[PDB]
Design a protein around this nucleic acid. Structure first.
Ligand SMILES: [Zn+2]
Lengths: 332, 12
RNA sequence: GGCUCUGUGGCGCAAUGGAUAGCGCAUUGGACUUCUAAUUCAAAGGUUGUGGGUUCGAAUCCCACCAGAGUCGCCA
């Protein structure tokens, strides 16, 4: 039985592991959707009612997401950091009024300052096009940045021709190895002496992947790639998803402790969702965003679910009910 | 997410 | 993660004091060699950002965003 760093208790329960050497969209989607829970490079059948830590899975859709103040704050932080640069070093630690006037004359003055003037906007001559308003716009325009009259910068999201013969993959192997071993050591010591050829191969290179055969006349790229970040002379690579043309599922990846205060890991999910929206808007039917795993006894799950509203489903149902109905019973 | 099994585990 | 302080239009924000409100540089008016002491003053603007609230008015109070700076924090 694995460790439960939580409420102290004697917990007995196992999600029996398994794995089949046959990759298909139906097989994997069923093995992740019907009822399942896994932690590792394996598919585990969960039989879990013995614990002190509730668990649940949540899936959302992109139809209801809009930016908030926190999203604006993180976006501004990232933009300003990337643009203006920063090299910090942290350390530990006269006329008078009348009573009747005050009320009535001032209220009427406000009313007759609002009313007597020509001030009105008039215009009457799928729909995510819009530019006519004195209103802030969405995040789509801000996904791509603008640079001043200088040449020192780099922003790009380049596709990966996935085939294990390249120099970049070899360097990325060592970079990810060092990053994740350091992260593991920092968060909680874990014996790193197991790092061998087979161990690292199964840790990073191995993954359930298959090719996509398009039955159309395509002018586009099919997304099974990696996402990179741009920094000083050492490039990062953090992104893992394989997309047959019905699938949206991304697996978590590790970060250096610096990312705790300089990165945008949470915003990475929003960026990838925006990329999927951009690649799907052209001609396709896709409303898929499935990533949920929570051990929730805290006020964090409300922030996590802020991505809601979204449709819910338990494994006895045939009607798509909005999360509002399920909000109280389980969430509260 | 929050889980202690993921951080400490003899598997990959 | 929330909230603290700032809210004219290009710049400066002066007006504010428990019965509290708008201005200095381009500018339509005097003249041609010469001009930011070739003057000098008389000039184009307005729900002091909105959908609304409460002590009488808020400027001073508040929910949400639009503009800006921010300690300590986090499950990435
Ligand atoms: Zn526990």
């Amino acid at each position: 039985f694995y460790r439960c760093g939580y409420c102290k208790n004697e917990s007995g329960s196992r999600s029996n592991g398994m794995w089949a050497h046959s990759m298909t969209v139906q097989d994997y989607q069923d093995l992740i959707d019907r009822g399942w829970r896994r932690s590792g490079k394996y598919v585990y059948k969960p039989v879990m009612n013995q614990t002190c830590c509730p668990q649940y899975t949540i899936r959302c859709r992109p139809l209801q997401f809009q930016p908030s103040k926190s999203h604006k704050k993180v976006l501004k932080k990232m933009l300003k950091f990337l643009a203006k640069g920063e090299v910090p070093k942290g350390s530990c630690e006269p006329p008078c009024r009348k009573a009747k006037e005050i009320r009535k004359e001032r209220k009427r003055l406000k009313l007759m300052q609002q009313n007597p003037a020509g001030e009105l906007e008039g215009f009457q001559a799928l729909f995510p096009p819009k530019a006519k308003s004195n209103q802030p716009k969405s995040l789509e325009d801000l996904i791509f940045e603008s640079l001043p009259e200088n040449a020192s910068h780099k922003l790009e999201v380049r596709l990966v021709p996935v085939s294990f013969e390249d120099p970049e993959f070899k360097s990325s192997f060592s970079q990810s190895f060092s990053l994740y071993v350091k992260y593991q050591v920092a968060i909680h010591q874990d014996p790193p002496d197991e790092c061998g050829k087979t161990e690292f191969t199964r840790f990073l290179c191995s993954s359930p992947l298959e090719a996509e055969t398009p039955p159309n006349g395509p002018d586009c790229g099919y997304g099974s790639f990696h996402q990179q970040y741009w920094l000083d002379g050492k490039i990062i690579a953090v992104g893992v998803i394989d997309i047959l043309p019905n699938c949206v599922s991304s697996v978590y990846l590790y970060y250096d402790p610096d990312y705790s205060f300089l990165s945008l890991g949470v915003y990475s999910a929003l960026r990838e969702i925006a990329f999927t929206r951009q690649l799907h808007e052209k001609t396709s039917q896709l409303s898929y965003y499935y990533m949920g795993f929570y051990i929730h006894s805290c006020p964090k799950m409300k922030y996590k679910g802020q991505y809601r509203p979204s449709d819910l489903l338990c494994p006895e149902t045939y009607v798509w009910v909005p999360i509002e109905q399920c909000l109280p019973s389980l969430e509260n | 997410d929050d889980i202690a099994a993921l951080v400490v585990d003899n598997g990959s």
